């Protein structure tokens with residue numbers, strides 16, 4: 001099947017894990033990439049049902065499979081906390097404005 005379905009993109013367990021690990025590491029080293037400085041704090045304005053503690057950080061997960069390196073981030077994001085716990089996988093696809101919806 002598809003573990004995480006973002007809009008029309010499909011990500012597996014290891015895809016999310018690989019992306020999350022990349023973002024978490026940059027977070028640890030205080031590093032960011034891209035015009036929007038990823039990874040950066042995700043305040044959860046959407047009020048998603050996160051079962052892990054804040055603070056949260058969003059990081060792009062690419063449909064292609066490459067680890068984000070500051071280029072075009074696309075619409076999908078993995079969200080993790082300081083414990084490197086996956087808070088969830090969200091996307092701009094299906095949402096209005098600069099809002100998000102959870103990939104299912």
Ligand SMILES: Nc1nc2c(ncn2[C@@H]2O[C@H](CO)[C@@H](O)[C@H]2OP(=O)(O)O)c(=O)[nH]1
Nearest residue numbers: 036040041042043044045046058098099100
């Ligand atoms: N939609 C949304 N934007 C957030 C959230 N937390 C931080 N932001 C940031 O707040 C601003 C307005 O939405 C943007 O800079 C956005 O960054 P991103 O565009 O990288 O998501 C959140 O929970 N939801």
